Amino acid sequence: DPVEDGLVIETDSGPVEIVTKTAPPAFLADTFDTIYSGWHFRDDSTRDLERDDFDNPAMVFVDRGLDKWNAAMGVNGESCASCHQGPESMAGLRAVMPRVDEHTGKLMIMEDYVNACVTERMGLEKWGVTSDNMKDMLSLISLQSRGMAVNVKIDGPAAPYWEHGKEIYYTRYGQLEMSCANCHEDNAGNMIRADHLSQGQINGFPTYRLKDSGMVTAQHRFVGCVRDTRAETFKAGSDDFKALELYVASRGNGLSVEGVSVRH
Amino acid sequence: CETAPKEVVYVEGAVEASLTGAPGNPEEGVRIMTTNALGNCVACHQIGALPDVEFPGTIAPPLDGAGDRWTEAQLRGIVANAKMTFEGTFMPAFYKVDGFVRPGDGFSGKAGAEPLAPILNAQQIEDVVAFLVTLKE
Ligand code: HEC
Ligand code: HEC
Ligand code: HEC
Ligand SMILES: [Zn+2]
Ligand SMILES: [Zn+2]
Ligand SMILES: [Zn+2]
Ligand SMILES: [Zn+2]
Secondary structure (H helix, E strand, O other): OOOOOOEEEEOOOOOEEEOOEEOOOHHHOOOOOOEEOHHHHOOHHHHHOOOEOOOOOOHHHHHHHHHHHHOOOOOOOOOHHHHHOOHHHHOOOHHHOOEEOOOOOOEEOHHHHHHHHHHHOOOOOOOOOOOHHHHHHHHHHHHOOOOOEOOOOOOOOHHHHHHHHHHHHHOOEOOOOEOHHHHHOOOOOOEEOOEEOOOOOOOOOOEEEOOOOEEEOHHHHHHHHHHOOOEOOOOOOOHHHHHHHHHHHHHOEOEEOOOOEEEO | OOOOHHHOOOEOOEOOOOOOOOOOOHHHHHHHHOOOOOOOHHHOEOOOOOOOOOOOOOOEOOOOOHHHHOOHHHHHHHHHHHHHOOOOOOOOOOOOOOOOEOEEOOOOOOEOOOOOOOOOOHHHHHHHHHHHHHOOO
16 A cells, blocks of 8 residues: 655755645546555655665666767767757656647657657667667656656547557456556555555656666556566557557646656 | 366356366465466465465455355366456456457567467366365364
């Protein structure tokens, strides 16, 4: 069951409060009394790793992301900063992602925006969606919305995408016949062997997993979750997993963007 | 001399006939129930009779006393396919080979052609059942 605790991160520019427990979005009001960050289901020693930036191992990869943002890695020496200046240019973006882009009408996860610039504007071969360049860059961008409320839009042009993700969320995949909801909705708070089940929220991604000693994206988490039902899994960055990321993101509407979280 | 997964006859979830014709071995039942790639029963159920298994789950009530709550035939049907006793249950079917959505090849993440191998073979089911029958009082 979820621990009674509060999260205020010590940082270089002062305390930042993280909302880790709040009322669910209206579409989940008959489902949960309360939505929670996955932080609430971790043991205290792991929870402590997110409480300040000095101790948070994810900040190594945020800093490396910042090096890559400033690096002249384009074919003509272009850098992210050459067009966007500081990474604070991306303030707020992570909080409202994924979204239907205002100009193209395409569903975008963050990986799609990064690769649009990488390929069209820096003349580079696209970055692998779980490459280090990508995970570090998402880490850096995600930090520019830390403390902001997750607020993903689910109506209008987003609605069909969101509905497609909803269907995936409740589909019982694999030989094990298990859906996201069987574990994260029906059994949040319970122990599945040594793991304390959370609501499977992604407000904390990108995430440093202690098991792997590295960053993980929501796309990569999803790949593993469906595989482990004894199923044929989906490709990271696939249309169906972009839809799932939209849907799962919205299940944590109201929780804060953690920036870069720490989990097992 | 096995009844195959698709040939099993469930009546109100129960399976009256041995899946193999050979007696269950309860000690092997225990091994099957506490090994991750086999029954993995302890991921969801505590078993008080086995105090040395670590990190038992709390998804479902302990298995102690199931030998009192169910007949052998009921237990066989629950192990082979618990969905025939408890509709829509989270408990997966251990003797089921098709009717899946995106059936996988083990944990590879690749497509597996149905019929799949069942998670447990027929004698493994009988072995688990024989142990479950001893869980009394
Ligand atoms: C270096 C790898 C990067 C990274 C990580 C990003 N950019 Fe760019 N970007 C440029 C332009 C003209 C746009 C469109 C602006 C608009 O739609 O109004 C973008 C967009 C982005 C985004 C999405 C922003 C959004 O609010 O939708 C992101 C996350 C992003 N970029 C990251 C321009 C350029 C460049 C000029 C040639 C260069 C070089 C880059 N961007 C490099 C990068
Ligand atoms: C259906 C495709 C999904 C999706 C979208 C997610 N899960 Fe799982 N999950 C399970 C366990 C034991 C864990 C670790 C403990 C926990 O924190 O809950 C997870 C973890 C996740 C996360 C990370 C959450 C975080 O705060 O870091 C996410 C985003 C996630 N899941 C999504 C267990 C299961 C299942 C048990 C058999 C099943 C089925 C799923 N998960 C399915 C999904
Ligand atoms: C490994 C082979 C086993 C064995 C031998 C059993 N289980 Fe499970 N089980 C799960 C749930 C949620 C239930 C309750 C059914 C419902 O109401 O939905 C059960 C039920 C049982 C029973 C009957 C109840 C009783 O204790 O008498 C028995 C005998 C039983 N199980 C044996 C859930 C799970 C799992 C979660 C994914 C796992 C794995 C298993 N069970 C595995 C096994
Ligand atoms: Zn500290
Ligand atoms: Zn913008
Ligand atoms: Zn614009
Ligand atoms: Zn689809």
